[PDB]
Amino acid sequence: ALIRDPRSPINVESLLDGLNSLVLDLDFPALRKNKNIDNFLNRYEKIVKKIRGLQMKAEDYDVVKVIGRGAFGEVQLVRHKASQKVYAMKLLSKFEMIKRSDSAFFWEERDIMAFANSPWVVQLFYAFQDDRYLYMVMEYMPGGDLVNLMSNYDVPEKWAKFYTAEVVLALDAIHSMGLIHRDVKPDNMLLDKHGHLKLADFGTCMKMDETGMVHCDTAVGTPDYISPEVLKSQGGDGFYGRECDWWSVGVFLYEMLVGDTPFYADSLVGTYSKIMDHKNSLCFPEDAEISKHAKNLICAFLTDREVRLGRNGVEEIRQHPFFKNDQWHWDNIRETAAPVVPELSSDIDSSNFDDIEETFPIPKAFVGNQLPFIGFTYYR
Ligand SMILES: CNC(=O)c1cccc(Cn2ccc3cc(-c4cn[nH]c4C(F)(F)F)ccc3c2=O)c1
């Protein structure tokens, strides 16, 4: 009965993952001296290779261009050969994830994009694997990200109101699924064909307790955007709530209106120290020319959690005077016209993206390197 459920760990895709993964981890001359291992391989090695050809696989896609990179892989603009549809495909290297003891962040990332069913969340259509990579096949966002937008325009406060509102709604939606994002930044804010925002890169997300809190002893995210409480949790037993995402919205709003990040330093350790000393290090440039309302919202986000705007819920963010505007309302913003509408040449126009510039050793005994990746495959 669970076999049909796309959420169950024992659906057909996961059962096939196990059989495929066992053959992968055993098929070596050394391990084949065990008769058990050889008797199984003989029975199943021909049909597994047949199954491999009929399963969704990488060679079914044309690689048009590489449009993104990360610690463990890259994102490619692809076209599915048979259907001629266009997607963005993210790859995660199995060797690197094992080599750097980081093998479990992709579960929530896959599940959010697959099941959120939200206009604010990039949607996942397929997940598959081969012996080297994980693959997440996603709806393509041809508008680019907000780093690219900020590098090409001087963002007036009217635009900043729009993108900050859309981010607030997107984070609220993620919070209502029980998740804290923890890596809010402009590189994770993607724009669709109509210029509206979606969140991406859910690698550092975490589900909250029945109390709304998370225990964590590890500081995560990006150094420019990390909140004091998350940073402080590296020294043991962090207990914090969703409000760490609102701190990172404050950094984003500063960066859009001022042109630099508010805790900039030449060293990572300097950035870490400035964030700790934020009550003294947060300083707007003399030539800023930023409104009183914008400066008040920025400073209401860039405080300690016990005092931070949003600690009581999103309604206190939405009423803030900075969001007074003559173009949109909180309940209809994504159906109004975005400030920048992309002009697109073809369905593989990638002009809003800058251009971009090892394996396991053969085992002596059973290691099970493919075991952590069982159950990743998903067919919509
Ligand atoms: C631990 N995490 C990693 O190692 C890691 C590996 C690879 C990339 C990243 C960060 N990154 C960058 C771009 C990116 C782009 C899309 C996306 C979806 N639809 N369209 C696009 C478009 F590309 F068009 F913008 C979706 C996710 C990402 C994304 O995650 C992180």
From Swiss-Prot:
Gene: ROCK2
Location of the active site: D183 (proton acceptor)
Protein name, per record: Rho-associated protein kinase 2
Binding-site positions, ATP: I67, G68, R69, G70, A71, F72, G73, E74, V75, K90
Family according to the record: Belongs to the protein kinase superfamily. AGC Ser/Thr protein kinase family.
First and last residue of the signal peptide: none
Zinc found in the keyword field: yes
GO cellular component, one term: centrosome
Key words of the record: ATP-binding, Biological rhythms, Cell membrane, Coiled coil, Cytoplasm, Cytoskeleton, Kinase, Magnesium, Membrane, Metal-binding, Nucleotide-binding, Nucleus, Phosphoprotein, Serine/threonine-protein kinase, Transferase, Zinc, Zinc-finger
Modified residues (Phosphothreonine): T377
